[model samples]
Target chain A: HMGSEAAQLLEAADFAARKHRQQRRKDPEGTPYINHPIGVARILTHEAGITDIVVLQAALLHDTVEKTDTTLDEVELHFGAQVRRLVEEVTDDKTLPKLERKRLQVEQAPHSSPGAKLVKLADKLYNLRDLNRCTPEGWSEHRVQEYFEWAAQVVKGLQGTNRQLEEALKHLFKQRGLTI
Target chain B: MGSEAAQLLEAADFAARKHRQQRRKDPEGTPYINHPIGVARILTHEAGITDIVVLQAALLHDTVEKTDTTLDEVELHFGAQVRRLVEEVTDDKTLPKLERKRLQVEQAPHSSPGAKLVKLADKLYNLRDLNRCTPEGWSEHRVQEYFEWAAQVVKGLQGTNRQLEEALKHLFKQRGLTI
Candidate 1:
């Protein structure tokens, strides 16, 4: 019998928590990295009108491949192929230069599948909101502003997936003294 | 602004952190803490409830039953009044489902007035969400049965808040359900 959706979500959440166990956000509070993915999943499910189970699963697991040593095969074995593909689409090659990674996200956003775009939008949306409230120490207003502009460029290609979430990203940008 | 609102806001954040890993059983896969936040909202926004203890208790109502939070921790952070209110509304989750529902109805009339308000607001918001986002795989008959059982529990909370009680009754009737 198929386990309930909540059951599967809990499984994904557990997987994420374990994968991100040693990581902490650079914010003032040094928040656990797991909180970021949880926030992304919340935005996608609550704000982005995303109800597909695997997409939500991907949102929770989006950072595993990019940040941790977890492999795409491990994810696929545990969460199935569709979820693995969604995560692969968003996972950046961390070995690349930071500039190149950012460029790839911007370059790839428009071509991302709807599910991948939804995850990317939620990811960018939450990161933007975080910078507005709390930034890593020594991140000057100029750095913060630069990050917002770059995120807007990335999200620009992610438009039209979920207007509410897109509008939410726009609002956060406006709050940060940038207009999307 | 009074510190009461600030205190309630702190309690809301506390509850969210405690429930961050949990998700609702609804189709939208909404966060579980949203349910506690919803109960708090119904009390404060819809019913015009401003009592800090009531609001704090509403936000932390399920913490002890559903999470690792202890009542002593709740009292230390919030006060005796908030702890008592939460305890009054918390059911014994270890009980069998049918027995738990039976106990809720039996214990309803004994709860403090503040506890009654929390319970009423909770049932009302849940009934509202039942139609908006029904849990996957829950049959219509199962939903109807849940409505009637919830109504039974709410019957003893009749005098807590006229707005919420009436709203609950309306939602119950709207579903072609009877208490």
Candidate 2:
């Protein structure tokens, strides 16, 4: 049992929760956004069987630079360049229109690094499930259904990344009666 | 927000690793660690719980009760607040299952608010687990008995967290669950 890995993983989560503390998602539940990254990391650990410390840390910190003041330089200083790159891998420039960001995700999926693809694969699936759990207000059925469709498009480019991650998505789509 | 955030994640990691080999008795043999995570998820996402101490204990709730993990280990990693919170909801493995169920009813009212929150989330997940299954070949009647018993235990925990309490009731009423 490498206890050091456990402690190291804990560091990114701390950094994530602290940096993203005030922001909650658009969902009515206002789930502490910290849970979102934790969910993604768990998907890698338990579902994807991904124990790569760098990937897991990036999953937790994936949103820090996108959502908060944390710069890539700060991320690299604290967690190293590889972790920062993975975070940088999945990050979006939110200043862009939301739909364009979605387009960017689909376009970037094939080009993303393996570690980043894993984060996106799990991230999309988690978001897929959350759309049911706590859909943001004013999202029409078409908007919601379009999201499921858009995620499949993004996940399509993420193929061969991890079977477990893909299978989880497949099952959810099947359960929801959507085309995979 | 400071070290508290990291400690909370450490608690989640510790529970996941300790229960690595364990599996739930559901038909699919779901990972045992998922149960604690589900409990903690309910506390935060559904019950709107934000106190790190309660949330940490939620992640570690079953470690001491179901695994070789001890209170000392929990304390070593997460301090006395979390250790005691886990201890509060844990049942002695040495006791018979029937006796432990009764003891939860008897003891829950006296548990700390944090402890009560864990119990509510625990029962919530047990009852509403999306992957429904007949554990140990338990009959529908047997599942009902478990549901009724769980309600008795939860009854004592009312007012500790009303949103969670109502969610439990809503689950029962929604499915026409007994008790």
Candidate 3:
């Protein structure tokens, strides 16, 4: 059971949940941070029909290396090399300035591996959904407008990776009264 | 803000996500979490009630009963008082549906004052919705049965707050029903 695919997915979930238990999103509601990864995983599996175990497992552990003490070696040791690589593929450097990290996500999307593009696309979609539901309390209207515009740029490179997730993103934008 | 404002804000968003998929039985399937929001809004707006614990409980009242949410999660997010208040108003879903309805009426009088406060707001909106936002496929007869049943529940919930009571009477007249 320990080595089973399903068990690994569960372990990633348990690890992420515990690591981020005390953490919350900047959202006014302070939504638990682990939900961002869980939401991304759902978009891949339920919405996009992604059966790739590596992509799904990375979806769960994607934030660990960036936000927690989790390192690439730890993910590799636990989930093997494939998941570790994909997680690293989508990770940003914490040492970088915030806006630089944000810019890098947009710039690096087109050059990422297909698997990383898939994870990146799902992550942007989920983040967009949260921003749509309610703006983080401190963010200005112009800031939300800028976020949508920047999110669109990253997603632009990620197109054709998963048609369903892409289409869902389109619909979410339309629902939120965005032009694209 | 005593940070209670922040806590209340967080409670609302938590319940909204927890009940994210559920919709009321209305013709339009209005989001189900609105009922809890209405319950809390009425307690403050109509009843002039201000206890944060009671208000938070109102926001989360139906989450455990209607959604996959658990009491432990409630206590973890909001605290013991809010969780206990929600539990007091929650029905045992495992019971026979009819029996569950009966117990709510029977238990109303003996519930803690905070629980009774929640019940008053609950019944007020329960009646107001039937009067104002009547659900789909419900006939006059069906609505009447529910109206009278809620009246019975509210009977045990008296002496809690007069502001809520006066509004209930107004809603009843609009429903053309007797308590």
Candidate 4:
């Protein structure tokens, strides 16, 4: 048996599942939105060679502050300050205009902590992968291409944090016929 | 980093390094570590089986069979249970490829619960990827045959979790490959 550390990550996973219980992705198949955070966590740890627990925990909780009713205080109380901070760094403000939020991610990527950038890069990589597999019902090819362009710009600021994941993200872009 | 997740992450790290040189045989030729990680994700997300050893074993399952790692090394790095689970799913590399494939279908039904879960997730992930990115030079008939054989292998792994098994079956059906 590993110990309480593993237990805490397991608990964070359970907490995220509870918080995102009412949510589902907007993909054609409508998968549980929790899959996205799980995918992000997996990609960072497994592909990006990121082993930091707070980073992994933050990857799982990254959307909770932005996407769900969960608060940063609750994340810090349940997890810790490191996880809470990383999650807060990557979370976009729901009150902001869509374009502004996207612009903020691009502007903030260079200044964010390395852990937060890893989570953000993984999130976009997985998102693009899913889009290629099954886009939202009405996502025009132009819309899909634009999303990839925006993701690439955000990812550019995320360079050097984890080259492997940046390559993976670029690979996904190539798969979608983009030259990134 | 938290301590407990640290150990699991350590397993992830070990598996990634061990398989780092290998690449999936898919069209994209993505890193082979992605497959093992995909299997772990399917186990954790779809089956809701978060037992650390199970996830660890899933991450390292291919190393002993395909890489330079051995059961002894796995047992030393991980624990006996993880080694046992990885050992259970690993095919005999000494055997001819076809014989090893046949042995997988033959030995799958008798595997332990943990091993069965790993196998189920492995098959599902592989099938999904193959459906999305067909292997280069693999014909439609070959892909269909692979689906049917993988379904048979999965049929033997039936008792682990219904949700994952059903999802695997649906993935196969979605590919227009008969299960």
Candidate 5:
């Protein structure tokens, strides 16, 4: 329905699945694994209303670069500049120290596009969702609740450019019965 | 002069020399003397602290508890002001461990938050390092319990000066649960 072609998105999604097939999140237990990037794309296309094929492709491949030894050049060669930019936006820059990376992401979150922010928002939602789903067996209900509460506020708290992404967060939270 | 700097170069040198072979019970098994000096470094750098008294106190903070040295001897050698700050920061090993912690958090807050800040950073850094060294057979819930208690202790630090509240928030949310 959006401007991007379905055929092109299908090809990229297939490649993304191939690259990310072996990876799972840092989640503690019973993760389906593949649901991570699938949720990633769903957020980009559905929540953020982004129609870009490249952004969706990058969402699918988001975990590949860090988890594998894959390089940005490789991603660019396969998917082009838009996808490359989106991927870089989502990827954690380990070169910066841990606290510094958090600060930088908070700093840059606003300027990011609705597409990138959607992916970022979706990632947090999934993490919180997974936290909620695994509450009894894996994580405590309190911990899961705290994770979602902090995440929902943090996404809403972004001040500058990523407002579009922040807006989508409320809807994302509502999906799981989060009131705010 | 802004303030009399705690003359810890000699004290630290003396401690380092005296305990050259002693190792901390810490996970890394680093030289026990390194802990005090590491606390001093954190004071000087991260806390933007320059009071010679605070730095000196940090260096000598452990000696009274760990060594045969007496506080009177410290006062005689370092002078009353330096001795007082050091004494203030030093934990009384004679007390029951849990009681001592409760008392320190209660009493430590009154000595100006700078001293408390130094202590908080020291404990937080050590706890984080230990968390990273969690051995096999330790369950996640057990580790989480450690952090929840640590976070409670950290809450008492709101009485401190400087960025105590902000820093504690970051520590509680991110590193506290695991490390």
Candidate 6:
């Protein structure tokens, strides 16, 4: 569905698709691994008004090189720099402990581009969707609320970067009847 | 259903555009608007309610209080039904902050189960978001204080629904969930 630059789409797409082939979502509902990335792009397309081929392309591959054996240099060589950096910005640094990674990401927020933050917003929105997608065994009202809260911060961070995307995230929330 | 839902979606978009830059932060440095929207999304996707009226209203639930956007404007764009739901759901900003929260508890029993459900989701998201804030943002003591306050609020909605309440609490106490 990308324009004449089919190669850009393919290069990024194949890289992400292959890299994520083995990975799966932690939701326990058995979603396709690539669904997470593709879902993020879908939210970007439908909600954020993002039409750039590269942004969606990057969205598709954001977690690949960072978490997989694939290297950023390969991504940079194939997809070029912009998409690669956006992926880097969104992907967590596995080296740091979880909390520290969150801290670093939040600390890096003021410096992150709105485009990259948009990817994060898209990802968070999808996570919220997943949280509600299945009524997992033993899930409590408190747990559900907690999931929403994790998502809320992501939305807040997105709002801090771009209003349009923030509204989209909130709009999804509203559709679920969680206003107030 | 998705198409009719589009109308409300557009209205929410307009509202988000208007209040794009605004975010409320606790003294702990967490963003405020994030908590509200997080809760709103939970209602839409989780509650399986597709009525555009409820969906649109949820998105703009706090516009009257958080932004200069008027209730009339909400009514005009989203219609009277959503505007009313939002009004019923929106906190009375005129009251002192603490009193406003008390009103939320008092009013919970009178509102629809959906309203209570939404409130539960909203608080749950707020608590979880607060849990993820940077260590430099707030001390452990402050985090516990906020968390305890939030737990009390979640309890208010427990009478309306049990499943939703349990999910909210479990989310707040995950691995590494601390003040």
Output the number of the DockQ-best candidate.
4
lDDT for model 5, please.
0.60
DockQ winner between 1 and 3, please give it: 1
How high is the DockQ of candidate 4? Answer: 0.09
Better by DockQ, candidate 5 or 3 = 3
lDDT of 1: 0.80
Clashing pairs in 5: A110-A161, A110-A162, B5-B52, B6-B52, B6-B53
Models ranked on TM-score:
4, 1, 2, 3, 6, 5
CAPRI-style grade of the A/B interface in model 6: incorrect
The reply for model 6, stretches above 4 Å from the true place, is A1-180, B24-36, B134-137, B159-162, B171-179
TM-score of chain A of 3: 0.92
lDDT (Cα, 0-100) at A174 in candidate 3: 69
Per-residue lDDT tens digits of candidate 3, residues B1-179? 22444455456657767876666787755556567767876776657677888988987888888898899999998889999999999988999978988998999899999999998898887777787766898898888888777877877888889988777767666667555
- Tell me the native contact fraction for each prediction: 0.02, 0.02, 0.00, 0.17, 0.00, 0.00
Docking class of 1: incorrect
What lDDT is reached at residue A16 by model 4?
A: 73
Flag regions of model 3 displaced more than 4 Å: A1-180, B173-179
lDDT of 5 by residue, B1-179 (tens): 11121133345444443444455554544455556656665555455566566666676777776777777877876677767776767777889967776776576446555567666766655665556676345577756655676666666666564554455566567743421
lDDT of 3: 0.78
Judging by lDDT, tell me the better candidate of 1 and 6: 1
DockQ of 2: 0.03
For A103-174, candidate 2 gives per-residue lDDT tens digits of 999999999899999999988977888887766777887888888888888988999989988988988777
State in Å the error of residue A47, model 4.
20
As for candidate 3, its clashing pairs are none
lDDT at residue B21 of model 4 (Cα atoms): 59
Worst 10 residues of 3 chain B by lDDT: B1-10
| Residue-level lDDT for B21 in candidate 6 | 49
Query: DockQ of each model against the real complex?
Result: 0.03, 0.03, 0.02, 0.09, 0.01, 0.01
For A1-180, candidate 1 gives per-residue lDDT tens digits of 434454455457657766776676787655666778877877765566566888888988999999987999999998899999999999999999989988998999999999999999989988878887787767887888888999988998999889999888888888767766
